[PDB]
């Protein structure tokens, strides 16, 4: 009949719910909300949803399920779905962010039909370059997940911006550009998803000059290949370009 920070953590991790069996009373008639600060490690930003997110057997969570439905049933959904992480390592990351990274199709969408912001940027040093994608569309494509991709796009809940650029302006045929390594397997790879993108380019947005963005050098997405060095690419771009 009561719950703390901890005790859900705990339950959602074990992934069960009859120990979050009756989590809606406290907080109907606590008025406390999954969304404020108790229930959030101030270190990271880990809402009992993000915990969930990570601990997942076989891709199964029915907990991220009755845990949604009791945010929603407490007047707190966007709040709650769009949480990122407060740290400056994984700074951006929201639930929708780590389904994608997790290739999981159906957690994915269970997730942008109850409202998760598919513009969200990963802002963190996760992301970054040190050893891009940024956005889930962006992130979706770069992982090779076109079956996700399409689910983002052609979205019936919430449209995925097909032109959307991160920080370094880059859109989703940049991110691309920027993830191709040269490999026989690569290229291969990094040509359909720009071919695929440029298609939905099509049904989508026959109107959008996608080709022509350019990021914060001010680079298109084929100028960048050319000083980036990604020949391979470079050279599918322009032979494309060339209607076939
Ligand atoms: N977006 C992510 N992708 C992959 N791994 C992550 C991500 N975010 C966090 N992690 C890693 O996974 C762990 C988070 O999972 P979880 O909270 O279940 O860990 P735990 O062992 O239960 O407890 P603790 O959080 O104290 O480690 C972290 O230890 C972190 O190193």
Not at 39 to 61: I, S, V, W, Y
Not at 92 to 98: D, F, K, P
Not at 139 to 168: E, G
Not at 192 to 198: Q, V
């Amino acid at each position: 009949r009561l719950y703390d920070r901890r005790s859900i953590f705990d339950a959602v991790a074990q992934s069960n719910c009859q120990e979050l069996e009756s989590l809606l009373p406290f907080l109907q008639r606590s008025k406390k909300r999954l969304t404020d600060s108790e229930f959030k490690d101030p270190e990271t930003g880990k809402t009992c949803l993000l915990k969930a997110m990570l601990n997942l057997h076989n891709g199964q969570n029915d907990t991220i399920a009755l845990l949604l439905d009791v945010a929603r049933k407490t007047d707190s959904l966007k709040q709650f779905v769009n949480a990122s992480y407060t740290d400056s390592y994984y700074k951006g990351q929201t639930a929708l962010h780590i389904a994608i990274e997790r290739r999981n199709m159906t957690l994915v969408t269970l997730l942008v039909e109850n409202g998760a912001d598919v513009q969200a940027a990963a802002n963190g040093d996760f992301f970054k370059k040190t050893k891009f994608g940024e956005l889930p569309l962006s992130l979706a494509a770069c992982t090779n997940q076109l079956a996700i991709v399409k689910f983002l796009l052609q979205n019936s809940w919430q449209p995925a911006d097909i032109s959307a650029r991160d920080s370094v302006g880059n859109t989703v045929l940049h991110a691309l550009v920027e993830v191709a390594d040269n490999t026989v397997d690569n290229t291969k790879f990094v040509t359909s998803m720009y071919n695929e993108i440029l298609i939905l380019g099509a049904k989508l947005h026959p109107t959008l000059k996608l080709e022509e963005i350019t990021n914060r050098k001010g680079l298109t997405p084929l100028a960048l290949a050319a000083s980036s060095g990604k020949i391979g690419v470079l050279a599918y771009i322009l032979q494309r370009e060339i209607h076939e």
